[PDB]
Every structure is written in C-alpha cells, then in structure tokens.
Nucleic acid binder design. Structure first.
Lengths: 416, 35, 184, 235
RNA sequence: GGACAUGGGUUAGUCGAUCCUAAGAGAUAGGGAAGCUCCGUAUGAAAGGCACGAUUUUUCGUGCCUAUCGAGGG
RNA sequence: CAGAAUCAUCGAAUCUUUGAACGCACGCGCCUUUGGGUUCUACCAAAGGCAUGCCUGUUUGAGUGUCAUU
C-alpha cells in the first residue's frame, strides 16, 4: 500500500470544525444552531488540538463527524427549506397585490413537529424527568414577560397554559417537597417517579429587557421546550387519570383566577388548615405552595375571582399578611408572615407562628437543598504528575469559608 | 365539500397539542443548587 | 473582471439599441408614459382586476350549493387583456383606453399597435414594463391591457385619465414619434 | 461520569467589536436618511383631513353637547391610535391634557361627564374601552413605569413606590392596582405618578412584517371589552 | 525427449508494478461536416475552497486566494 | 458406471467479468447506511450509489437585462 498521508484517520478525521459542518450540511449558521438546539448537539474539545486541525493552531470549535452525519438525514431540515420556499411565495403574493393568496398561504404555512426529536432525544420517561428542570425554569420564566416582536403572543399563551397545567399536576399529585426563597425568586423543588425536579420562578414584576440578550436563540428554545411540556404532561395526566389537556374556562381566566380556570376532570402537612391570602402577597406562588399540602386556600378578590372564602369567614386558620398594619384584624386566623409557610415546607413541621407574626423580626431562612512537616514535604517533590494540588484547590475554598463562618458565630454572639 | 364544511373543517385543523404519548448525549450537568 | 458570455451579451445588446438608427415604429417604444400618470393609470386598473382562479371557484361553489339545496346577476366588469382579444376590441371600437407594454420581446407583436389605435381613434399609452401589466391580471406578463367599459361610479375617473394620456403622451411627443430613434 | 462544561468558543472580544461596528453603522444610516421629498398630493391630503377634522369639531361641540356617558365602569382605558401631521390646535392641547403626547401611549381615566366630553372631542384618534381587573394587572405588572423625580424609571422596586407614595397609603405594586381598579381617594395622585405605557403594535408573523402601515387593524372609537383582548394580545 | 499419459510446484508491510511526469496522444468548451466524422485542449467556458460569525429578517452576511493515457523520478 | 424425470410446460425468480457499457482508467477513488473482532478515535467487510445529450417540473442563484416602490 501507499504511504498513508497525515490526518487521514483518528483525531484528524472524527473531529470536524464548525465551518466544515456548515458546508457539509449545506446550511447557514443560524439554521445550523437551530438544528443543534433542537437535536442534542454540542462541541467536543479534542485532546490533541493541532493534531485535529490539520496542523493549524487557531482556536476553532469542533464536532463529532458521526454527529454531523446524523443531521444530514434529519427530516426537519427539509421543513427549514420549505419555509425558505414559503417566505418567498408570501413575498411574491404581497408584491403583486394578492392580499388573498397571502392569506391562504399563511394559513397553509409549513410546520414541523418535534415528536421524533423528543423520542430520539429522551427515550425513557425517566430520561425526560431528569433533563426537564431547565424546561420548567424556562417556561415559568416567560409567563411573566411582556410580549415582544421577537416572541409571539401565542407562544406566551403556550407558556401560561403549560405552566398552569404543571402546577395543577403537582398539587393533584402532592409531589411538592420543598420551596426555597431567594432574590432569584422562589426556588421550587418536587419529585416525580423517583426523579427530582427543581426550578426557579421569577418574581412577577414589571421587569425590563436588557437589550443585549439575543432573542432569536431564546425563541427556538421555547419552540423546543413548549413541545416537550405537552408530551411530558400528557403522560403524567394519563398516569394520574386526568384528561390532558385539562379544560380551561376563558371567562374565569380573564379574571386573574390562576389555576381556577383549569379543571382536572409530608403530603398532609397543612391538611387540617385554612388559609386566606391578603392583597399584598405573592398570590401566584402562595396559592400553589399551600394547596400542595392540603391547605384550604382563599384570597382577596382584588387578586382574582374564584375565591372559595370571603374576608368575613372566620374558618381561616391563618390570615397571612405582610402589610405592616392590620386595621380589621380577625380572630382564629393567627396573622403570620409568608416566610413561615416556606420554613414549614422545608422542615415539614408546623413552625411557630408568633415569631413570624405581623411586625415580628423575621427568622433566618434555611436552604433545603444545601513529623507533620516531613509527611507534607516529601510528596511535594518526589512524585511526577502532581495531583497534590487537589488540596490547594478543593480544600482551600472549603477551609476558608469554614473558618470564616465559624468566626461569624463567635462574632455574632459578641454582638448579642 | 361545500363552503361551510371546508370552513368548519378549517377550524378543526391547526390543532395539535399533546394528543398522543411518545413514551409508550450525556447529562447536561444540572446547575448547582441554591446556596 | 472577465464577464460571463451572457452578461456581455446582455450589455452589448443594450448598447447596440441606443447606437443604431432605430426605425420610427420601434422608436416610439422608447419615449413612454411618465411616472405620475403611470401610477394613476394603474390606480384605476387595480379596481377592475379580473378575479383569480381562486376567487372564480369559491364564487362558483356558492352558486352550486345554492342550486344543490334550492334557488340573476349583473355583467362582470373587469379589464381586457390578451393580444388577440385586445386587438379585436380596438378594431371593434369597444376599447376606451389601451396600455401597451413597452418592452415586449419580439417587438413584432406590438409594433403595429400605436398605428392601429391611432387609426381607430382609441386613446393609447405605452406603459413602462410588462410585469406591471402582468400583475394587474394575475399573470407573469401582459403584452397589452385595455379598458373597455367601467361602472358609472368610475366613469368620471377614466375620463379624467384619458384626457391626461392625451395631454401627457399624445399631445407631447407626437412629432418625436416620427423621427428615427437612436443614432446616439 | 463528569462532563465538564468549558468556556464558550465565542471570542467575546470580536463579538462586542462587531456590535460596536454594528452600532457605528446604524447611527450613520439614521444620519444619512435625511430630508426626503414630499409630493404635492400629501399637502392636499393634510388639508382635506384638516377641514374634515375641523368640521367634525364644530358639529360635535355646537348643537351636540350630548354624551351617552358609558356606564357601569368608573374606570376607562384610552389609547391613541394615530395622529395627523399639522395637528389642529385644539386636539394638540387636549391630547397633552390627557398625557397622550406621543402615539401608542396608554392612560387610565376616571369616567365622568368632563373626561368623556374631552374623549368625545378627540374620538377619531383614540380607541377606548373598559379594562378588566386581569388586564389592568398585567399592564402594571409587565409595562408599569413610574415617574420618580421626573425620569423614565421602571417600577422595579416596591421601596420606590413606598418612598414616593407613602403619605397616600401606597406601599406596594399590589396597592397600586387595587387603588386604580377601585379609583379611591389617591387615584389622582397614583395616576399622576404613573408613566404612560407604550403599546407599540407587535409584528411576529411574516405577513405583518411586510404589509404596509400595519397596526393590527386598530379602529377609532368605542370598542367595549375588545380593548381587553387587544391588551391580552399586546400584553 | 520439449512426445503423450498421471500428479505436484511460483507464498512478500521491506523485491518490482500499482504512485509521477517527459515528447506527444488526448475527452471537454467550442467550430466545422450532407454525412462516417473533422478541428480544437488554453482555447471570448459562470470551468475551483478557505476562513470568520452569541444567529442574520430565527429567508447568509463579511473577508482572502486563483481533465485524461503515456517508461527516467520513488 | 456408481411426486420420480438428462421429462414436458412456463405467468416466479437467479442471471459471474464484460459488451451501447455508464464513477475514473485498462488498477484507483468519492458518497450514504449497516456490521464484525478471545483486537473497537485504528482496521476491515458488506449493501446501496456517482456516465453524458436532451425534455417537463423543482429548488438554489447571476445580471451597470427591463422596471417598479413617498
């Protein structure tokens, strides 16, 4: 045989750069990212760079050739071109003035379904439950964002619909376990089918967009996750016997009723308790958390209709309110702060009300997720690969903080 | 199909939201928990 | 810059037309209707666009279901297009205004049209580009359009336009249409 | 079993350089798109509109001092659909009197004889209706903007609301919505504090980004509860 | 017997070919020819790929460079 | 010599290297998928592909070709 040339096998063959992967698939960058987002595709750094780059040196992202060749036969790639076809035909219709073939074309616009993407990306339901936490964080984040030109209104409607159905599921299944608070939001945490699901809920607030996030990327992720949520929730409701999707009443939903619109046609920590929601608290987070543990929940009508209770009904065990003043304070509805509920959630134990009562100092919150010289100088010099640095990195940041916070206890006792 | 059936069938189209069940690449290395 | 053989062909051909001594009958197709009257002509025309094959069916199904269950109209008003159909209309003096595409490829097709429309006394104009005339009728291209009859509501607008084409196309030029074009 | 995620292969150095060049090229284009021509037709169209508008005012005010006074809502919602170049002097002042100094501005108004009259004066320019509690909720909670010390300030902190509105028993964002929907004593002060919203028409599908002068088909006049649906699409 | 009859025998990563071009042959672009065919191979040929990029209107933008057979070469 | 047939009939198949002969030449490649190994980023195997002229359609385009868009 001939003298085999350089870079004809091994790390110079499997590893293929981004630019080559573009011209091999015949795609533009933006479409390539889209099919990389929808599928599971990510760069992989080769062990020997200049070997894998035909002797070059410049920093370049690499992919597996096996990975790229899978994208060659993806059926959805065709639906990208069919939309490139569709766009030109709709531009043609508007150019000539056919305001009707424009309307019919838009009705028959090409579509793609991620059914086979979900199956090929997550085969087993347990695989979905593992890799769904970001999806929960994603969809929940978007339901409180003003609709922009980049993100269509119906996509927001899909977030709100899919967000509430999941909240209904957890309350119905009583699978909620913990609910931590932070300036990020309300770090929720539940478990389903053995696997653990965690996410974060943004504070529903009149936020601003920093005008530097590239919304094009964020749009494809929604077009991915909003496909995932429908089929993940579908199995959960079928497993729980509920008819997916649960029916939604428009008239109730336009009254800020939250979960009340949808009908689902230490789990008992708050079973024998009745709570009322005043008009200054995060009703959206509190409605979900209390009903997850059997708490009978009513709320101020200004927060939305559908309240089973009124203000005057004394059956409420705890009238939650963070307002500094309560003019018409009731009886039998001991008035505490919202931090009491989450503290009870974390510990699974009925906490002490008066310490969390109105005007009382807030207790701190807890995150539920959280010869010698010779023996230390010989291995520093008489060994080769130097994994001795593990102490200098792993132990250092743990020792310093442990020394720091242990001194916090002593210094705080001195303050008292 | 006359005018109305094609109209009402057009409404019955454009509707595909979780009708069937699919369930009959390493882990993304989930972010660290709250601190 | 080595041009392709067809870019060279396109541009040399364009240069050739402006250099040669164009005959008067082909010279008139270079001095055309202005832009302001062109959009005004097409403002009217886009009222009388013939219904598309999409509309011609959706309408005819409505009658079919009316017949199929249990069951007459007015003359359809639209614009007349097609070379043979229009040439007949001028001769039959049924055309009120003729608009001639300025750039028909074998110029034999329309070279006789200004003479014939002048002969029958049909006010005509040479509108720029065929693809403009094509979109009025939902086609790729139209060699010639003609307005034959409009509703009473727009009868005043057509009369206003016709006097403009007289003043802007035929009142102007006229003599310049009788000089050999090109030679520049 | 440990998939270390490394630093991005994005070269943030060149990214911001491209961004700065992009902004550098964008400002030049705006400074280049200058002093366009104006045809003799648009001068007519302004005059026809101005006489059309002026005659409408005379018929509205004289002999028609009657208002149907929309009932069963103390609170209305008014947004400005469009304005006419070379504005009539009367409408120019009245729109400012309603804080709608610029198009696509959203302002709440307490229903009464006086307000409905001024709305009737500027009716051909405004789409007004009755917002529901939910629609008002998302407006404040997604597009609510404050006027702290007179700058364009987002309602990002409840402390700012308490700081500037404490003496009128307004402490929180939820206090704002409850007051506005109920139109209490402090309704005037809250409405003075609130910066007008901006409901610029949304353009998502391909047909909208191409049709000329697309404004979602916003008419002018009374729309009942359709303004709620318009808000739902808009927010 | 080199005759016929009946069997057996040529083993390669390292020896040669397969790998290359020379003079020329020579398909193509073209053009002749009633025609088999002829001329033509640098020729008035749109004749081969490289890199960059949070993704760019979620419709590709920006920048660079200019056949083939044929045995002494390995 | 040691449901048959050195049978008939023929609607199902098989049909090696070639040959108009068609991946390129008279051995060398490329492309997509699949597999193997008491060897698995290497090697190998297998199956299916890649001639030119033309026609209809399709998609991606080129043009200081024609023209339009307050």
């Amino acid at each position: 045989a001939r003298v085999k040339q350089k870079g004809k096998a091994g790390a110079a063959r499997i590893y293929i750069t981004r630019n080559q992967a573009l011209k091999k698939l015949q795609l533009t960058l933006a479409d390539f990212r889209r099919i990389c987002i929808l599928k599971g595709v990510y760069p992989r750094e080769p062990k020997n760079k200049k070997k894998a780059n035909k002797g070059s040196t410049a920093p370049v992202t690499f992919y597996y050739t096996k990975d790229i060749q899978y994208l060659l036969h993806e059926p959805i790639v065709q639906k990208f071109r069919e939309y490139k076809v569709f766009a030109r035909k709709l531009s043609k219709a508007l150019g000539k003035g056919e305001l009707e073939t424009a309307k019919r074309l838009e009705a028959r616009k090409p579509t793609y379904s991620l059914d086979h993407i979900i199956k090929e990306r997550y085969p087993t339901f347990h695989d979905a439950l593992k890799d769904i936490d970001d999806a929960l964080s994603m969809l929940f984040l978007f339901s409180t964002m003003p609709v922009t030109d980049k993100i269509g209104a119906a996509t927001v409607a899909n977030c709100e619909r899919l967000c509430a159905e999941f909240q209904h599921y957890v309350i119905r299944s009583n699978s909620l376990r913990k609910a931590f608070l932070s300036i990020k939001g309300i770090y929720y945490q539940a478990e389903i089918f053995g696997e653990q699901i965690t996410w974060i809920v943004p504070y529903k607030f009149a936020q601003s967009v920093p005008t530097d996030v590239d919304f094009r990327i964020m749009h494809t992720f929604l077009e991915f996750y909003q496909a995932l949520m429908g089929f993940v929730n579908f199995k959960l409701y079928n497993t729980l016997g509920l008819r997916y999707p649960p029916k939604i009443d428009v008239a109730k939903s336009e009254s800020a009723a939250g979960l009340a619109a949808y009908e689902l046609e230490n789990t008992s920590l708050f079973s024998n308790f009745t709570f009322f929601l005043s008009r200054e608290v995060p009703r959206f987070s509190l409605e979900f958390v209390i009903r997850a543990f059997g708490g009978k929940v009513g709320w101020d009508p200004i927060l939305g209709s559908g309240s089973p209770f009124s203000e005057s009904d004394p059956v409420i065990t705890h009238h939650i309110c963070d307002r500094p003043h309560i003019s018409q304070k009731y009886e039998g509805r001991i008035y505490i702060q919202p931090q009491w509920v989450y503290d009870s959630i974390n510990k699974g134990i009925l906490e002490r009300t008066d310490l969390y009562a109105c005007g009382a100092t807030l207790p701190p919150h807890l995150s539920p997720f959280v010869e010698e010289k010779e023996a230390k100088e010989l291995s520093k010099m008489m060994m080769s690969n130097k994994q001795r640095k593990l102490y200098s990195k792993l132990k250092n940041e743990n020792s310093k903080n442990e020394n720091y916070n242990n001194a916090l206890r002593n210094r705080k006792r001195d303050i008292e | 199909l006359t005018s109305e059936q094609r109209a009402e069938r057009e409404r019955e189209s454009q509707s595909n939201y979780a009708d069937h069940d699919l369930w009959a690449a390493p882990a993304p290395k989930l972010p660290p928990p709250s601190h | 810059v080595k041009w392709p053989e067809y870019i060279r062909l396109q541009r040399r051909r364009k240069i050739l037309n402006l250099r040669l001594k164009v005959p008067p009958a082909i010279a008139q197709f270079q001095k055309t209707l202005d832009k302001n009257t062109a959009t005004q002509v097409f403002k009217l025309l886009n009222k009388y666009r013939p219904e598309t094959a999409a509309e011609k069916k959706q309408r005819l199904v409505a009658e079919a279901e009316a017949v199929a269950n249990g069951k007459v109209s007015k003359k359809p008003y639209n614009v007349k297009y097609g070379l043979n159909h229009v040439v007949a209309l001028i001769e039959a003096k049924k055309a009120k205004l003729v608009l001639i595409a300025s750039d028909v490829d074998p110029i034999e097709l329309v070279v006789f049209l200004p003479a014939l429309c002048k002969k029958m006394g049909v006010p005509y104009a040479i509108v720029k580009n065929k693809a403009r005339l094509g979109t009025v009728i939902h086609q790729k291209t139209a060699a010639v359009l003609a307005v034959t009859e409009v509703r009473e509501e727009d009868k005043n607008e057509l009369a206003s336009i016709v006097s403009a084409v007289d003043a802007n196309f035929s009142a102007k030029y006229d003599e310049s249409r009788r000089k050999w074009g090109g030679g520049i | 079993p440990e998939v270390l995620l490394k630093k991005r292969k994005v070269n943030e150095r060149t990214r911001k350089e491209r961004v700065e060049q992009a902004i550098a090229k964008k400002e030049a284009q705006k400074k280049n798109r200058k002093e366009t021509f104006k045809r003799a037709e648009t001068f007519i169209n302004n005059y026809r509109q101005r006489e059309r508008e002026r005659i409408r005012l005379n018929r509205s005010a004289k002999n028609k001092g009657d208002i149907f006074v929309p009932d069963e809502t103390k609170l209305l919602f008014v947004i400005r659909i469009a304005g006419v170049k070379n504005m009539p002097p009367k409408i120019r002042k009245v729109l400012r009197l309603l804080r709608l100094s610029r198009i696509n501005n959203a302002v709440f108004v307490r229903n009464n004889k006086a307000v409905a009259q001024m709305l009737r004066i500027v009716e051909p320019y405004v789409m007004y209706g009755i917002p529901n509690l939910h629609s008002v909720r998302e407006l404040i909670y997604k597009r609510g903007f404050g006027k702290i010390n007179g700058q364009r300030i987002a309602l990002s902190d409840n402390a700012l609301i308490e700081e500037a509105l404490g003496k009128y028993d307004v402490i929180s964002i939820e206090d704002i919505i409850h007051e506005i929907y109920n139109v209490g004593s402090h309704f005037k002060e809250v409405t003075k504090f609130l910066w007008p919203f901006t409901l610029t028409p949304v353009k998502h599908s391909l047909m909208e980004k191409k049709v000329k002068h697309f404004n979602e088909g916003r008419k002018a006049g009374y729309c009942g509860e359709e303004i709620n649906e318009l808000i739902k699409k808009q927010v």
